[PDB]
Symmetry: D2
Subunit: 380 residues, 4 copies
């Protein structure tokens, strides 16, 4: 039974009328059966039929013991973070996403937790980083925007060697291309704001958990810090996940073709994309994933040319994130860090002229044609 | 300019078409204007027009500098909590609500933050408990379900003279009966799931802040822990908050009358309601609140008769919380702590037969008659 | 069992989890149980659980056999209209609302259905106009904006003695002030866009029917012309209808007081409101309605002063319709028929300076003070 | 600029914040600028920014002068029908859809309009059917479930020859495969409940019009009979139309492969599908369309085998309609007419054992495998 076939099934047992869409329980409380006993549901912060339908499809998708839905990706990562106590340590790949950065830096500390940074690509570096009191190993792969690959099976054994939990933020791959729990991770997180919902109209975060005692501790925090995804947002996620395989299938192929057109373009200096045969990490990646994705970036050594591509293209929207049906284009180097000086950007592997693209589901000839016209209009 | 009157004010400067209802911005991202600069908005976790319209109304209602909306009441209490660093001190009443209790005993510790519990009605204790390390004082008055009154002006001065922040969870009072920031509090919090939304159909928390620095610090956390209330939810709060003054007016009056009836009823031992002249705290409370709200409880000395009133009443629903248009009834001891033993149930100031009622907006003659019959049908 | 009390009753037999809010069935199709038989539901155009929950409440409020919800007020009036065959006769007041007017003069004719217009306050005319071909009598009392009262018990007997159906568009009264099916009417219609939903945010029409055959005939049309109100809309009506009794109570009282003030004001020539003792029809209306509602108008003999009151009032919005929590003000002559000439504007019983107000639920001292200032700032 | 690329573009001029998703104007009224003049919007029944964004994308998709959105497909067809006056005629292909049937039969008549039926495949039949006073020619192609083809260019000239309007109900093809306005039709109707929204969670109907005076007459009825699609439903339509090209592309290909597997299956007697080279009409169809679609049917001469396939398959849902991401299966012969006797089904070209499939976007091997197992389990 394929993913494609699994994403559209409606297994809503509770529904007496078998509607084709999951009924939306937009309520806060439920009436109890008696003065002494509760019902299956009582308060939405604790549990809700609609969110249960989504959390449950997502556990199957990730082959997890239990899945949890949060108001956003950051909320999911913040909860994970509230699992390490005072005097513990966290080995954080130092490449990891902006909000993840800010979190590991400015927030995790106020809690008496220690934060180690590394290059999860160098096993020795991460080997030396895994201390006695190391309780969490937190990875991302491909990284962004460079697409550098890390070995999740091995980093899993080093960490598991100290009795530590491995968190794999799979947002960039989604359950259709990768399933980290089957590579040794303990918790896979997905910003569902990206591929899962795929329409850039809903914030959501997902924690997919391996191990019951573990899941019980996540539920404790989803239910106590009250960050469970709202019923309406769950419904929009349920509606969107249905075409996830269909959308990734077209998107990724658009990305392959635009990466190839750019790869051999006179004005493009380098192209990062794990799908290119020439990508350092290519073979490593595909040993743990079925696809490169639909996000990639490139350099042009010319910041004035890069701004032009970004601002001139008619089919790409200038925006953050990726994974929507609309193709996006940006400069993470002078934008996704506008507060980044000349040393603030150099202190972060990236270069003022770097352009990142999130390919959508348009006709790739429309997109390649759009980019070509854009290079041919830049004056000198 | 009265509150009833302020609540229906539609202040949407952004909307070109002057809709009578605030346009719902159900979107996760916004397009940036150029490659270098951002727009007023960029990402719903960071900010959204619909949520801004609500956070603004809420700041005006509470006379706060800025207000913040969180995915739920607990999320809001959880952020205030992430303001206090490793090894600092938190002094919080003993009465403090269930979820707050749990958060105070099992999550705050994980940060090395120390928690002292006090009976905030006894100034000495408050005095005794507030040292050099105290950075947060956390009140709640009336207490649930006894409706104990604490002096908020005097507790604020003590803490401030110690440089501590004062939080008042004003959920049971809401903006139209009390505005704690004018009594020394620094942050007022509401479970907007209760009176603000008013229909039992949306989960939401609000944080009303005094002080630009503080606010900046609350915003920093609402944004990084990605917990701002979602747009559909903000829209439902905006919609339900409009009848807030109206709902409370009829509700409060209903509770008054129903306490009247129970107070002089032969099978009712004690009635807890701050509106009753005979209630310890009456004059204190009304010295800092324009009214006694709509939740109250009573004891009957008979766990068997209490269950009976609870299950037999035809017009009250057996449910958790309050502040909704529907009248609710429950038993905080044998229910809102159901899995509670003999001393583990009395380990909380509440005899297991205490019944709590949340008056709604129905005909009070229907509700009072509903209770009378239930008292008469009880088997001996 | 009072109306205020009936409005919050949650009667959802179908829902397994007893949510406090009716589950929204946002779906177009339902799965059938076998290849041969259907289920309770199959297609939202045919029926939906959420819409059923509302159509049921509405039948109980109006003491009707069955009720139907349409995409809007006009859709409902348009269906009643599709009940009358080729070459039959329709007798409908002259006063009858704009959209109804248009529908009566430009669409009903296309069917060979003949339309006679009468001043339903003059029984003779009604008598004179009702022949052997009359199959529908269409009333509206009070009339807009003059608030003319027609005798609904006596008009029903005449038509019935001629075998004609009687429709009463009860939009301005709603179920808590009048229930026309207990006065001889056969179908009562409401623009649920007005008092029922009560927040200016949903378009909806309701048809409350007396008689199984008739109902069957209305259902046949709601179903075939695919016009039943959509599920999200039904849910918003269910949500807003709960404060209906509460909203009207404060609203009606507000209108009373504001008519009081204007009636004895030096710059106001005539005030039209059926609650005023001096109003022709007072005793008739209150002989068939429990109240005068919240819409009324006044003349000032000065088109220039009327525009001024309309544009200067700070607390009234310039807008069409009524029944919302927000106070509205407008000029039916120079606005709700703006593109109206000199005799084409007087070709409707309304002097071009008539101002209509719809009282909302704000502080009446705020509203009355708002009007006073506007009378005082008017340039001479 | 391809359709695929056009379906995801956001051309919302009015939006000051450029959200990626169209802002939802869930309101009924808008405030007017002054006492004498309206704004662009005033009442949702008349016009709404969100519906305008959808009606406008749909005009581009169909190459129409203006597009209109209705509460449902039937509402769209019912409005079309209110365009022919008393004493006019309608030439209705007699094969046309159920609700279309019911309408042409039981409703259109009460209006003094004459109804002719034909086999739009026989030009002579339709030649003889086009009278002097014929104002509407109403087609469907492929028909359902037979997929019989009609020539839309020629039937367009015969009709236009009498000054008549041609209505083409394109629901089964959608704008991605066919655009009838470019073949002589005047109005193309789409049940948007099908392919446009594609998630079976929203009812909607669409009229795409050629000719301004024409469009003005449709707007008159959408605006007067109040059947304009609700803002929320428009938003769900906007969200769904975005993957329409992506969904039809996979769906149609699944259909091709399942039609081919069934075509050569021992237990299948006939397969109707315009994409099969062997289909009477094949070449005719593709002269006016780019694809066969994803709906087809087949016969097995065995009603007991057909029920079994329908009720045994694990990946097909038993439901009406088509065009959703979920594959559907049914027997229109003994189900989509359960009230169809032994002569009531014979009086309608179809046969008790006929099975219709609407292919979804699953893995076609999952679906073919599911059907094969189903044939191999039927006992004798
Ligand atoms: C986009 C992104 C996030 C942010 O998630 P939100 O849902 O918007 O808070 C987290 N992690 C990664 C790896 C991302 O790339
Ligand atoms: C209900 C309640 C809360 C919890 O708020 P949620 O919206 O349910 O997370 C917090 N404080 C008080 C005093 C409450 O009564
Ligand atoms: C407003 C109004 C209508 C129209 O209803 P819609 O919901 O706007 O279509 C019908 N009747 C009366 C008497 C009205 O005042
Ligand atoms: C499905 C169908 C319709 C029905 O439309 P609704 O939107 O559900 O009312 C109309 N026409 C055709 C041709 C169809 O096949």
């Amino acid at each position: 039974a394929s993913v494609s076939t699994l994403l559209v099934n409606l297994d809503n047992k509770f529904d007496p009328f078998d509607a084709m869409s999951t009924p939306l329980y937009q309520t806060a409380t439920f009436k109890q059966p008696s003065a002494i006993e509760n019902g299956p549901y009582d308060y939405t912060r604790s549990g809700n039929p609609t969110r249960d339908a989504l959390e449950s499809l997502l556990a199957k998708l990730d082959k997890a013991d239990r899945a949890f839905c949060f108001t956003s990706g950051m909320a999911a990562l913040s909860a994970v973070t509230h699992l390490i106590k005072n005097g513990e340590e966290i080995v954080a790949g130092d490449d990891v996403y902006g909000g993840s950065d800010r979190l590991l830096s400015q927030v995790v500390p106020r809690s008496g937790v220690v934060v180690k940074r590394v290059n999860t690509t160098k096993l020795d570096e991460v080997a030396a980083a895994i201390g006695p009191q190391t309780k969490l190993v937190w990875l991302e792969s491909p990284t962004n925007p460079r697409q550098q690959i890390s070995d999740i099976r091995k980093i899993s054994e080093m960490a598991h060697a100290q009795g530590a939990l491995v968190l794999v933020d799979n947002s960039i791959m989604s359950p259709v291309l990768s399933r980290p729990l089957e590579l040794g991770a303990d918790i896979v997180m997905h910003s569902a704001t990206k591929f899962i919902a795929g329409h850039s109209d809903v914030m959501a975060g997902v924690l997919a958990v391996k191990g019951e005692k573990l899941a019980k501790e996540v539920y404790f925090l989803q239910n106590s810090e009250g960050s469970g995804l709202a019923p309406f947002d769950c419904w929009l996620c349920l509606r969107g996940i249905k075409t996830m395989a269909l959308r990734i299938e077209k998107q990724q192929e658009n990305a392959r073709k635009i990466a190839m057109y750019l790869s051999s373009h006179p004005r493009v200096k380098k192209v990062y994309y794990a799908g290119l045969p020439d990508h350092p990490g290519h073979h490593l990646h595909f040993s743990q994933a079925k696809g490169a994705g639909s996000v990639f970036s490139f350099i042009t050594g010319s910041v004035a040319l890069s701004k032009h591509l970004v601002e001139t293209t008619k089919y790409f929207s200038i925006a953050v994130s990726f994974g929507s049906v609309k193709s996006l284009i940006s400069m993470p180097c002078f934008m996704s860090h506008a507060s980044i000086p000349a040393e603030v950007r150099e202190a972060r592997g990236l270069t003022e002229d770097l352009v990142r693209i999130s390919a959508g589901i348009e006709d790739v000839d429309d997109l390649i044609s759009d980019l070509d016209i854009a290079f041919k209009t830049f004056p000198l």
